[PDB]
C-alpha cells in the first residue's frame, strides 16, 4: 500500500480562495519517497489540530516534480493550514473572513 510522505513540502503557488469558502493550495514535494500520502491538517490558533476540513480525498504525491493541488475548507477566523508531518511540516497561517 501507500506510505505517508515524511519529506518536506513547499508552496508552489499562492493559496487561493474559491466561491464556496475553500482554499486552493499547490505544493511541490521535495522527498524521494513518492508515491506517498500527503499529511494534511487544520491546526487552529491554539496549535491543536482540527477535525477533517479536507475536501480532497486521499491526496498523494506520485512524482516529486509534479505539483499536487489540495482543496481545504479552513474554519472561520485564524487557523493554520498544515501540509507535511512532524518536523518537516509546512504551517500556513490563514484568515477566513465573515463568520
Amino acid at each position, epitope marked *: *500500500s*501507500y*506510505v*505517508m*510522505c*515524511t*519529506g*518536506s513540502f513547499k508552496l508552489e503557488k499562492e493559496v487561493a480562495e474559491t466561491q464556496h469558502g475553500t482554499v486552493l493550495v499547490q505544493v511541490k514535494y*521535495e*522527498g*524521494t*519517497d513518492a*508515491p506517498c500520502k500527503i499529511p494534511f491538517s487544520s491546526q487552529d490558533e491554539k496549535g491543536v489540530t482540527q477535525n477533517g476540513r479536507l475536501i480532497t480525498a486521499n491526496p498523494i504525491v506520485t512524482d516529486k516534480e509534479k505539483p499536487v493541488n489540495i482543496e481545504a475548507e479552513p474554519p472561520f477566523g485564524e487557523s493554520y493550514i498544515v501540509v507535511g*508531518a*512532524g*518536523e*518537516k511540516a509546512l504551517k500556513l497561517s490563514w484568515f477566513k473572513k465573515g463568520s
Partner: antibody
Amino acid sequence: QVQLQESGPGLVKPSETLSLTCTVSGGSIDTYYWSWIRQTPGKGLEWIGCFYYSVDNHFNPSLESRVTISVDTSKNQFSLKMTSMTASDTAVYYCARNQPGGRAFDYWGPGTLVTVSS
Amino acid sequence: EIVLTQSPATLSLSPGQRATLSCRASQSVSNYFAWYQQKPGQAPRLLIYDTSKRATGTPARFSGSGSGTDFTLTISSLEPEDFAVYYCQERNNWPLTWTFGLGTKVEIKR
C-alpha cells in the same frame, strides 16, 4: 544524536515467541517511520516491518502472519513479536529509523543476536 | 518483487586504487537507491542515498550514480579503513517493501 538500542533474550526455544524492544534516544518515535530489520549469515539483510505511530504499519509479506509491532511512546520504546521461532530465524535483529523523505534507513541500532535453540 | 544483484561478490584492491561496485535491479522502481557500509561487528551504516547523495559522515571519495536498472557506488581513492561489506537497497512501491542486495565484500591488499 538519534540513537537506537535493541534488547532481547539471546536465546529462544524453538516454537516459542521472540520479544524484542527498541529504546530510542535523541528524538521521539511519535513521528517518522521506524523499522525492524534482521541479518543472517546465509541470507543477508531482510526488512521485517515498520510503523508510523497512530497512523499505519507495513510488514514484509514473507513474515506478516508471524509478526506484530507495538509502541510505548511514554518510554520511547517499540517492540517486535515473532511467533513460532524456527532455527532459520537465528539472526542479528536491528531496529532502525526510516529516513524522513527518503527510501533508506538513516540510523541503526547495534543489533542483538537471537539464537533459536533448546 | 524487485531483486538486486551486486557485482562482484568480492573486490580486492590496493590502497589508492579506484573501486566500482555495481547494483543491478530485476525491474525499475525508483531512481533513488541507497548504499550501506558494514564494518566488522558493526551495524550497516548509511553511506549514499538517493543514488548520489552523501550521507552525513560519508567522505568525499565515495560517490554514487545510476539510471534506472543498475546503479554504481564508486570509491575514488581506496583506503585501509574502507574494508567493509557494501549493500545497495531500494524501496519497492507495490507490494511495499525495502530490499537489499547481497553485498560486495571489499578487501584491502597490502
